[PDB]
Structure formats: structure tokens, C-alpha cells
């Protein structure tokens, strides 16, 4: 959800 990782879900 609110994971600030750039490789997280961008959709």
C-alpha cells in the first residue's frame, strides 16, 4: 500500500 519503494506497485 503505502510502501515508499520505487519498485513497488505503480498501478
Amino acid at each position: 500500500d503505502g510502501n515508499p519503494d520505487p519498485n513497488a506497485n505503480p498501478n
Partner: antibody
Amino acid sequence: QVLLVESGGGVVQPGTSLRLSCVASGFSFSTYGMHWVRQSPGKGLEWVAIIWYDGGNKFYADSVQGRFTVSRDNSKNTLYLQMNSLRAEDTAVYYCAKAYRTSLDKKYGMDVWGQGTTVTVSS
Amino acid sequence: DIQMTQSPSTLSASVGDRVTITCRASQSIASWLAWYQQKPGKAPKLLIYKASSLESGVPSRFSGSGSGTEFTLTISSLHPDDFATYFCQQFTSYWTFGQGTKVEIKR
């Protein structure tokens, strides 16, 4: 049927500005994140920028940080890349890529790329 | 932020031969690796995602294997449509690619 087509490339003089455009079709552009990747003969393929589906979260490479700006208009289904303060090492083919499908995974890459638009910086 | 190195840089083989391209990472990327194929003048096309999963429509002769720091791509029977330049990408810490491996036709 997922088809991305880039535009805006050309020959620019160093220190000027250029806005590239990527048009989408065959999928829900609003529900997907997008990437910009460039390929020069020397440095090879190099990631440039990612933008979130809503246009909120934007991340860049440190080489283009402070100069390049990514944006999108989900009403026109078009992705943008405003390149400012252009230097000779920014001369490459620029591709726009669509992110991978939402899953139970925590790390995501790219699946479909576009043809590409060529940017040449010269005097 | 993770460096990706490929080997060999150029590979010569004949049609029907088995070839294997190795892709090494500076630190562990688990299985967050993808394999691309690029023919000159065209965009890269994704063949394998998450190290081993073939994407739709890619022939079963392509295979991926590996985890952590070293990965491999293996074509069991090279077809005249498989001779191209191959890149590997990690997608756990931003997105970085390998130098590339060009498959050339031995004659």
C-alpha cells in the same frame, strides 16, 4: 494490441529544452505506471524516470535529476518527459515502457516498450 | 543501484545449437531479474520475467534459471529468429541493465 508510440525527438542545441511524448492504446493507461528508458551506443540501456498511475509518485535517475521532469495526462492517454538543460551525453533513443501487471509481488518491472524517438544534442 | 554484468559479450553459434548467457549481479536480487531480446532498429522485447517465467507467446526453447547473484538464459535449439542482442535487467533496486550479449551466426 498494447501499443506505445513516442514523439518529440529531434536535433536540439545544448542547453535547451525538449518535451517528449508517449501515446498509449490497447490498455487502461490511467491504471498503469509508466517508465522512460534511453539507449546510447556507449552507455547502453539506462533507466530515466518512472511515474505513478495517478501522476503523484515520480522517481528519476541521478543523471537526469534536477533537469528532467516526467508527467502524464490520463485524459489524453499521453506520457511526457520534459528534458531541460540538455547536454551532449543525453543524446540517445528514448523509449517509453509500461509497468507489469498488478500481482502479489513487491517488486515490479516493465513488459511492453515502444518504438522510440531519437534525441540528438549537437552544435 | 545494483550493477549487472553479462558474459560473453559476443557469442557465435550455428542453427540448432545450445547456447547459454550468464548475467551476474553485484548484490543479491533474489529472482527479480528479467530477460530482453532486441533486434537492430527495434525495441527490446521481454522474453522472461522473474528469472524463469516465460512470457506469453515466447517459444519454449527459451529458458531462464538462477537466483541471487548469477542467472542464466538458455536456448536449446537456435532458430534464425533467435540471433539478436540479449539484455538482462534487475528490478528490485530501481532498474539497471547489462551490457548486452550479441548472438552471431557461425558459418
